[PDB]
Amino acid sequence: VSEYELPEDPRWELPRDRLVLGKPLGEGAFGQVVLAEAIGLDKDKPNRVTKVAVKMLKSDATEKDLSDLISEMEMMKMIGKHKNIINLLGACTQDGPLYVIMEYASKGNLREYLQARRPPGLEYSYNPSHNPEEQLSSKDLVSCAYQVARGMEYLASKKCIHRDLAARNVLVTEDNVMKIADFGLARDIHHIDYYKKTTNGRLPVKWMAPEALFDRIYTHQSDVWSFGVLLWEIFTLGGSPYPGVPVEELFKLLKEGHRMDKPSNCTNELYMMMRDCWHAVPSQRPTFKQLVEDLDRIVALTSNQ
C-alpha cells in the first residue's frame, strides 16, 4: 500500500490505534467491513467510545479496487451528511491499509429486518428468523418508506444516482433509523452480467428500470423505479420481487407492461405509488421530492393501532 499515494485529509484522518477492531459485518469480493469501537472519534469528546463500521480491501485487492474504495470515500465527502444515508465518519490512510470509517447500523439490512418481524397471518410469507421480533405497525412501514424517500431526495439533490436501490441496501440503526448504503460506489466500466447473483445471491436486474436493463441508462428516474420495487419489498415485509419469474423472461414481461401485483397487505394508494414509480416512460414517474411529500401525508393519516 506504500506503493501508492493515499489522499490524507486532516479533517477526516483517524489514528489507526484509536480503532478497536471487532467482528466481521460483511464480505464481498473486495473487500470487507468489520465492526469497531472508535476512541475519541469526536475530537471534543476524546474519552468517548463510538461503534462504527470499518471498510477495507481484501488481501487479494488490486489497484482498481483501491481506486474504487478511495472514490467511494471522496464521493461521500462531496455528497455530505444526511440522517437517512450511511455517513462517512473518518479514515485511516497513513501507516497501513486504507480504512474508510462509516456509520454502523446495528439492526442490519431492511430486508432481513422486515422478515424477522413477519407476523403469522395469511398476509405474509413465513417468518424465517430464529429470533423473531415485535411486528411493526402500519405507521412504521410507511414511515420506513418516508425515510428512504427522504434519503434518496437528499442524494438526488446532490446529483447522486444510486443505481442499485433495494431493501438489501437500506440499513437500520439501533434507533430504527433507515440509512441508504452503497450510494457512493464506483460504476463498473465493463458491461453487465444480468444473471450474476450478489454475495447473498440476489439478482440486481429485478430492481432495474427497463431503460437501465436494456440500454444501461441510469438516472434519478430509474432510481425512482427501484424505489417502487423497494416499496413492494416493504409491504411484503421483505418479499422477493417477481416470485417465480426467471431473468430471461423478466425482459419480455416488463416490455409488455407487466408489473408485480399488489401485496396482500397494501393500501390502493400505496399500490398506485408503486405503479407510478414503474411508469414505462421515465419522464412520467414521480420525483423523490413528490414521493417525500406524498409519503409524509400518508404517514400522518396512517394508523399505528
Cell of 26: 460483511
DSSP label at residue 212: H
Grouping H, G, I as helix, E, B as strand and the rest as coil, residue 305 is: coil
- DSSP codes, 54-68: EEE--TT--HHHHHH
Rounded Cα–Cα distance for residues 246 and 256 (Å) = 16
Rounded Cα–Cα distance for residues 125 and 123 (Å) = 7
Is the C-alpha dihedral spanning 292, 296, 298, 299 positive or negative? positive
Torsions phi, psi for 92 (to 5 deg): -115, 115
Cell of 6: 493515499
CB atoms closer than 10 angstroms to residue 142? 25
Grouping H, G, I as helix, E, B as strand and the rest as coil, residue 124 is: coil
Q: Are strands 178-180 and 170-172 parallel, antiparallel or unpaired?
A: antiparallel
Question: DSSP alpha helices (H): ranges in 136-255?
Answer: 138-157, 210-215, 220-235, 247-255
DSSP label at residue 284: G
Q: Are strands 88-92 and 99-103 parallel, antiparallel or unpaired?
A: antiparallel
Q: How far is CA 230 from CA 70, 145, 237, in A?
A: 28, 8, 10
> Are residues 82 and 153 in contact, defined by beta-carbon separation less than 8 angstroms?
no
Catalytic residue, candidates 42, 68, 164, 175? 164
Rounded Cα–Cα distance for residues 187 and 73 (Å) = 14
- Report resolution (Å) to 1 decimal: 2.3
* β-sheet bridge partners, residue 179: 171
DSSP label at residue 38: E
Burial of 30 (0-12, 13-18, 19+ CB in 10 A): middle
* β-sheet bridge partners, residue 13: 91
Burial 150-174 (b: 16+ CB within 10 A, else e): bbbbbbbeeebbbbbbbbbbbbbee
Asked if the bond preceding 184 is cis, omega within 30° of 0, the reply is no
> Are residues 76 and 140 in contact, defined by beta-carbon separation less than 8 angstroms?
no
217: Cα within 13 Å, side-chain hemisphere:
7
Asked if the bond preceding 201 is cis, omega within 30° of 0, the reply is no
Cell of 78: 462531496
End-to-end CA distance of the chain: 55
Task: Tell me the domains of the chain and their CATH numbers.
Answer: 6-104 (3.30.200.20), 105-300 (1.10.510.10)
164 included as an active-site residue:
yes
Rounded Cα–Cα distance for residues 105 and 107 (Å) = 6
Grouping H, G, I as helix, E, B as strand and the rest as coil, residue 270 is: helix
Rounded Cα–Cα distance for residues 41 and 48 (Å) = 8
